[PDB]
Design a protein around this motif. Structure first.
Motif, PDB file in Angstrom:
ATOM      1  N   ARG A 170      18.552  -7.397 -12.219  1.00 38.84           N
ATOM      2  CA  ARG A 170      17.689  -6.234 -12.016  1.00 38.84           C
ATOM      3  C   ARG A 170      16.298  -6.421 -12.642  1.00 38.84           C
ATOM      4  N   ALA A 171      16.285  -7.038 -13.818  1.00 41.50           N
ATOM      5  CA  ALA A 171      15.076  -7.447 -14.502  1.00 41.50           C
ATOM      6  C   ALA A 171      14.243  -8.368 -13.627  1.00 41.50           C
ATOM      7  N   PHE A 172      14.888  -9.419 -13.139  1.00 44.27           N
ATOM      8  CA  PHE A 172      14.189 -10.411 -12.345  1.00 44.27           C
ATOM      9  C   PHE A 172      13.729  -9.839 -11.013  1.00 44.27           C
ATOM     10  N   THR A 173      14.533  -8.966 -10.413  1.00 43.42           N
ATOM     11  CA  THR A 173      14.127  -8.440  -9.113  1.00 43.42           C
ATOM     12  C   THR A 173      13.063  -7.354  -9.276  1.00 43.42           C
ATOM     13  N   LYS A 174      12.783  -6.957 -10.515  1.00 41.68           N
ATOM     14  CA  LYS A 174      11.661  -6.060 -10.768  1.00 41.68           C
ATOM     15  C   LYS A 174      10.355  -6.861 -10.724  1.00 41.68           C
ATOM     16  N   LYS A 175      10.368  -8.048 -11.332  1.00 41.33           N
ATOM     17  CA  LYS A 175       9.261  -8.991 -11.218  1.00 41.33           C
ATOM     18  C   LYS A 175       9.027  -9.301  -9.746  1.00 41.33           C
ATOM     19  N   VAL A 176      10.080  -9.748  -9.072  1.00 38.20           N
ATOM     20  CA  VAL A 176      10.013 -10.098  -7.656  1.00 38.20           C
ATOM     21  C   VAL A 176       9.311  -9.044  -6.799  1.00 38.20           C
ATOM     22  N   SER A 178       7.288  -6.670  -7.965  1.00 31.94           N
ATOM     23  CA  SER A 178       5.926  -6.562  -8.479  1.00 31.94           C
ATOM     24  C   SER A 178       5.050  -7.620  -7.817  1.00 31.94           C
ATOM     25  N   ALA A 179       5.618  -8.807  -7.626  1.00 36.45           N
ATOM     26  CA  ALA A 179       4.991  -9.839  -6.806  1.00 36.45           C
ATOM     27  C   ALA A 179       4.775  -9.313  -5.386  1.00 36.45           C
ATOM     28  N   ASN A 180       5.830  -9.282  -4.574  1.00 37.78           N
ATOM     29  CA  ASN A 180       5.784  -8.719  -3.211  1.00 37.78           C
ATOM     30  C   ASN A 180       4.817  -7.540  -2.969  1.00 37.78           C
ATOM     31  N   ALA A 181       4.393  -6.868  -4.040  1.00 34.55           N
ATOM     32  CA  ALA A 181       3.448  -5.759  -3.936  1.00 34.55           C
ATOM     33  C   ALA A 181       1.970  -6.187  -4.042  1.00 34.55           C
ATOM     34  N   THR A 182       1.662  -7.204  -4.841  1.00 36.79           N
ATOM     35  CA  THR A 182       0.281  -7.686  -4.886  1.00 36.79           C
ATOM     36  C   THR A 182      -0.047  -8.424  -3.600  1.00 36.79           C
ATOM     37  N   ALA A 183       0.928  -9.175  -3.108  1.00 35.36           N
ATOM     38  CA  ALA A 183       0.810  -9.878  -1.847  1.00 35.36           C
ATOM     39  C   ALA A 183       0.822  -8.914  -0.678  1.00 35.36           C
ATOM     40  N   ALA A 184       1.201  -7.662  -0.905  1.00 36.32           N
ATOM     41  CA  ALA A 184       1.075  -6.670   0.152  1.00 36.32           C
ATOM     42  C   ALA A 184      -0.413  -6.487   0.389  1.00 36.32           C
ATOM     43  N   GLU A 185      -0.772  -5.882   1.517  1.00 38.67           N
ATOM     44  CA  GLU A 185      -2.179  -5.640   1.870  1.00 38.67           C
ATOM     45  C   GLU A 185      -2.944  -6.891   2.308  1.00 38.67           C
ATOM     46  N   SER A 186      -2.382  -8.067   2.034  1.00 41.12           N
ATOM     47  CA  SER A 186      -2.960  -9.335   2.470  1.00 41.12           C
ATOM     48  C   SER A 186      -2.884  -9.474   3.985  1.00 41.12           C
ATOM     49  N   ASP A 187      -3.646 -10.408   4.555  1.00 40.97           N
ATOM     50  CA  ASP A 187      -3.640 -10.626   6.005  1.00 40.97           C
ATOM     51  C   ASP A 187      -2.254 -10.966   6.544  1.00 40.97           C
ATOM     52  N   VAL A 188      -1.536 -11.815   5.817  1.00 46.42           N
ATOM     53  CA  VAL A 188      -0.204 -12.281   6.226  1.00 46.42           C
ATOM     54  C   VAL A 188       0.832 -11.152   6.199  1.00 46.42           C
ATOM     55  N   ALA A 189       0.649 -10.239   5.254  1.00 46.77           N
ATOM     56  CA  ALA A 189       1.531  -9.094   5.103  1.00 46.77           C
ATOM     57  C   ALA A 189       1.450  -8.106   6.273  1.00 46.77           C
ATOM     58  N   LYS A 190       0.236  -7.721   6.675  1.00 46.90           N
ATOM     59  CA  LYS A 190       0.064  -6.769   7.774  1.00 46.90           C
ATOM     60  C   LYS A 190       0.556  -7.349   9.100  1.00 46.90           C
ATOM     61  N   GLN A 191       0.349  -8.652   9.271  1.00 53.16           N
ATOM     62  CA  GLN A 191       0.829  -9.375  10.443  1.00 53.16           C
ATOM     63  C   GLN A 191       2.346  -9.297  10.534  1.00 53.16           C
TER      64      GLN A 191
END
Lengths: 197, 172, 136, 106, 117
Positions: A170-176, A178-191
């Motif tokens: 659960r700890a590690f998937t909180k980091k995960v 948090s990652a997946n969220a900064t990479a959100a909004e990126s060009d690859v994410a909206k695609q």
């Protein structure tokens, strides 16, 4: 679908878990069942104690040894329900039954492997709320099963270590995330978002 | 007996040279098709007049449709039935959306509560009870209170696959 | 030291609760509970979504957390006017539920090539996230 | 890649049968992911292979194959009947079987 | 002869101008324009083989069959003319050349009767 399916017995009704387990066997699907001690039977405890005694009286009168064998463990009881549902005196019977393993508790291998449930055998989804029912461990202990306490002990331990595991995860998937969220909004994410991902 | 339609059947005693134009009698009959409907007709007729199918004729057979098939309605129902020990009258109330639906469930109810098969029943009357407070049975009344709401606790989802990876939840 | 008593907060069958029909010609479609027939049956009606006013078994539907003002027994046009007023579609459309539904419908319509583009894109994203997760 | 599969997996369930008599001429097949007879119509006609091993090498191989086609659906849960060039050996009840995507119609 | 003439293009995935049988083919919905690729030339006799009888067979088997194979220059050029044109049109849609170069396979979870190609 998978090379081995490990079923958490807890909360399943003896009959219907057996009925689905037998089928899967016959169709080629190896199965392991854990926690037969936390298996349920509908009907209250006394009825199911009473029934077990009805079974208890049957024995070959010239030799109680060559007669019907009474097994006390929640797993062996589960096995009896199951064997009843296989043509077990046939090679195809024996073949199916070697695909199956039943346990009390959750011993090695299977405690690091994931276990599943069988909704069509889940008591909570099946038994009308109000109806009384029996837990396999209790029934078993009253007809001579010797090891309820030891399983309780080992399981209490196991549950501790599994909670650690879960914590760390659960700890590690909180980091995960948090990652997946900064990479959100990126060009690859909206695609990916446009293609359903 | 199935899924019911309601028919008007009209029939009437073959004409004779001495009595052309015999009287003309109608019944509403709940049945699944018109072949039963006309049987059912003659069966009640032969219980009231001197006639039988052999000396009379069906004049008309018309299915009657519910006038307001999406108005919930409180139905009063009147029945004659036969038990294993004898014969009995009864009044029940049934809340539904059309007499046809309503008769459907009377029959299930008679089957379930009284072990009455279709043969053993006579519908005597089915009538929409206009003013609430002429509603007499508590199991219907319950549903006519103001601003009525209710949860549906302990929900069971149908599983589509034999194995499940979760552990369900009955929330709702 | 106040008392503190859980809750258990159920969606209620009530006039004006919107429901997502699960089986039949309708199915995937939304509708409102107009009147209420018994413990098992209600009268629904979903004019905007094209679903006929009809009696239905509750078991054929799944109650949504949405509701809106509706006179008990309101006829079709009235239901149509009130639905639009309360803007239930946009409210539904905005929900995780609605969205998850749209989401998997979209995945189901992908073309073998599009599917191929999805994998290329995931690889792309993984490279960067696998990087981020590693630096803090 | 890692996956090279061009068939859907399946399982030799039974011969066609009554309670007390079977008919080795028709086999009953469970096709992964097919739950209804509507789903199962897609596979009607597709070709099935039961692939197996043996000790004697032959046409240069130790791998042997019995070929068949799916012929009609069977009951309500996506099971399918199939017939084979020679009937399947029956030890195979519970074995895996391949259902190809040809003859194709897409 | 009812077959379908297809190509990789050879430069993309190693498949040449070749006959293929229409019932062994899944038609996807992706599409290049082919409206400037020759093709008139290509027919049944164009894939004329060369073979023999019992003697020939035994020969090719008796450890032989190494005295043949012996390609055709006309085929190598034909491949190039057709391909350069398709490649011209492939480049127009991004990722499509990569799509063409990779193999299709069923992944755990794919249900052919559900999938949209």
């Amino acid at each position: 679908v998978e090379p081995v399916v490990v079923i958490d017995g807890k909360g399943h009704l003896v009959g219907r878990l057996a009925s689905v387990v037998a089928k899967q066997l016959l169709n080629g699907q190896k199965i392991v069942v854990v926690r037969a001690e936390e298996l349920n039977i509908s009907g209250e405890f006394f009825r199911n104690k009473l029934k077990y005694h009805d079974f208890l009286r049957k024995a070959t009168a010239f030799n109680k040894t060559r007669g019907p064998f009474h097994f006390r463990a929640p797993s062996r009881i589960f096995y009896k329900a199951l064997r009843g549902m296989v043509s077990h005196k046939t090679a195809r019977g024996k073949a199916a039954l070697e695909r199956l393993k039943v346990f009390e508790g959750i011993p090695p291998p299977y405690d690091k492997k994931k276990r599943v449930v069988v909704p069509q055998a889940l008591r909570v989804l099946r038994l009308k709320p109000g109806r009384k029912y029996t837990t396999l461990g209790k029934l078993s202990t009253s007809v001579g099963w010797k090891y309820e306490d030891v399983v309780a002990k080992l399981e209490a331990k196991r549950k501790v270590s599994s909670a650690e595991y879960y914590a760390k995860k659960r700890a590690f998937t909180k980091k995960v995330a948090s990652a997946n969220a900064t990479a959100a909004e990126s060009d690859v994410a909206k695609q990916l978002a446009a293609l359903g991902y | 007996m199935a899924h019911f339609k309601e028919y008007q059947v009209i029939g009437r005693r073959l004409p004779t040279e001495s009595v052309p134009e015999p009287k003309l009698f109608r019944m509403r009959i709940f049945a699944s098709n018109e072949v039963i409907a006309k049987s059912r007709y003659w069966y009640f007729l032969q219980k009231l007049h001197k006639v039988k199918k052999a000396s009379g004729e069906i004049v008309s057979i018309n299915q009657i449709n519910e006038a307001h098939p999406t108005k919930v309605k409180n139905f009063g129902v009147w029945v004659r039935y036969d038990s294993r020990s004898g014969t009995h009258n009864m009044y029940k109330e049934i809340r539904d959306v059309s007499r046809v639906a309503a008769v459907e469930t009377l029959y299930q109810d008679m089957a379930a509560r009284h072990r009455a098969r279709f043969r053993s029943i006579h519908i005597l009357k089915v009538a929409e009870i206009e003013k609430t407070a002429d509603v007499k049975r508590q199991y219907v009344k319950q549903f006519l209170t103001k601003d009525l709401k209710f949860p549906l606790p302990h929900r069971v989802q149908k599983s589509t696959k034999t194995f499940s990876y979760k552990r369900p939840s009955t929330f709702y | 030291t106040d008392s503190i008593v859980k809750a258990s907060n159920w969606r209620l069958v009530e006039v004006g609760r919107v429901v997502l029909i699960k089986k039949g010609q309708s199915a995937g479609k939304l509708a409102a509970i107009v009147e209420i027939i018994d413990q098992k049956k209600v009268l629904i009606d979903g004019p905007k979504a094209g679903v006929p006013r009809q009696a239905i078994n509750l078991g054929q539907v799944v109650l949504t957390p949405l509701t809106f003002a509706l006179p008990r027994g309101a006829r079709t046009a009235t239901v149509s006017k009130k639905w639009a007023a309360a803007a239930v579609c946009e409210k539904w459309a905005a929900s995780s539920w609605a969205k998850k539904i749209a989401q998997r419908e979209r995945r189901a319509a992908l073309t073998d090539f599009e599917r191929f583009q999805v994998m290329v894109l995931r690889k792309q994203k993984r490279y960067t996230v696998k990087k981020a997760l590693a630096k803090a | 890649a890692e996956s090279h599969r061009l068939y859907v997996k399946g399982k030799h369930l039974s011969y066609q049968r009554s309670k007390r008599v079977n008919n080795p001429n028709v086999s009953l097949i469970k096709i992964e992911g097919v739950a209804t007879p509507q789903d199962a119509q897609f596979y009607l006609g597709k070709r099935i292979a039961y692939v197996y091993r043996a000790s004697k090498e032959v046409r240069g191989s130790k791998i042997r194959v019995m070929w068949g086609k799916v012929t009609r659906t069977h009951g309500n849960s996506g099971v399918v009947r199939a017939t084979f060039r020679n009937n399947l050996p029956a030890k195979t009840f519970g074995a895996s079987v391949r259902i190809f995507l040809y003859p194709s119609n897409i | 002869d009812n077959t379908l003439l297809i190509s990789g293009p050879f430069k993309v995935n190693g498949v040449p101008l070749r006959r293929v049988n229409a019932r062994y083919v899944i038609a996807t919905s992706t599409k290049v324009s082919v409206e400037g690729v020759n093709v008139e030339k290509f027919n049944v006799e164009y894939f004329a083989k060369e073979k023999l009888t019992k003697k020939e067979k035994k020969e090719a088997n008796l450890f032989p069959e190494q005295q043949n194979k012996e390609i055709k220059a006309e085929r190598v050029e034909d491949q190039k003319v057709v391909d350069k044109a398709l490649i011209a049109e492939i480049k127009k849609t991004p990722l499509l050349k990569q799509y063409l170069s990779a193999s299709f396979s069923l992944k755990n979870g794919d249900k052919p009767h559900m999938l949209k190609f």
